[PDB]
């Protein structure tokens, strides 16, 4: 689809068998979701944002469906103010910026 | 043009008689630039994201050229770790997300 930016680019994704809402974020290297349980082992990691750094749990090789498109990759879980789909998964679904 | 997301989507912008590299960020409502001494009146503001909030100065109706595309709007200036072009200006240049 083609998404304009007059509003936040939110979409529905399915992860761990559950549905959630997330923002397509070209300004994020990674995909970060708010606290939630996910199967598998996780390693502690730190990421930076506009206001500083936070600690997150890193889960690898996780299947994520974004608007019907399949992706399998790294998902970070932690105290982010919003669920964001970063470039690591945006590239998998073939997303590009156009103008 | 069409910008792929294998790498951070950085582009050159012209603001206040200067050329700078800025990140096209669909995950940002506003445009935030690294500290720079711009003339004109401004208003104090707090913006947030991952990690917390930072204090910035808000300037209105500032002309900004992005990759040859002219735009004009609000620009926030403060201690951001990167120059960020948000949706307020992305809509003005007809930028869309496509997949």
């Amino acid at each position: 689809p083609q998404i304009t930016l007059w509003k936040r680019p939110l979409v529905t994704i399915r992860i761990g068998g559950q549905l959630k809402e997330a923002l397509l974020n070209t300004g994020a290297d990674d995909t970060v979701l708010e606290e939630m349980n996910l199967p598998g082992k996780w390693k502690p990691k730190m990421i930076g944002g506009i206001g500083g750094f936070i600690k997150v749990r890193q889960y690898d090789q996780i299947p994520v469906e974004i608007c019907g498109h399949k992706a399998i990759g790294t998902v970070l879980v932690g105290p982010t103010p919003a669920n964001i789909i970063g470039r690591n998964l945006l590239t998998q679904i073939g997303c590009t910026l156009n103008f | 043009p069409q910008i792929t997301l294998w790498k951070r989507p950085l582009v050159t912008i012209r603001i206040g008689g200067q050329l700078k590299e800025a990140l096209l960020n669909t995950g940002a409502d506003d445009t935030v630039l690294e500290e720079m001494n711009l003339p004109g009146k401004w208003k104090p503001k707090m913006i947030g994201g991952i990690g917390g909030f930072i204090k910035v100065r808000q300037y209105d109706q500032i002309p900004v050229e992005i990759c040859g595309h002219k735009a004009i709007g609000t620009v926030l200036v403060g201690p951001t770790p990167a120059n960020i072009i948000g949706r307020n200006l992305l809509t003005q240049i007809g930028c869309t997300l496509n997949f």
Binding site: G27 | A28, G49, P81
Partner: peptide
């Protein structure tokens, strides 16, 4: 309010 979700790894 939270409105700028820039993000990056160390």
């Amino acid at each position: 309010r939270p409105g700028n979700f820039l993000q990056s790894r160390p």
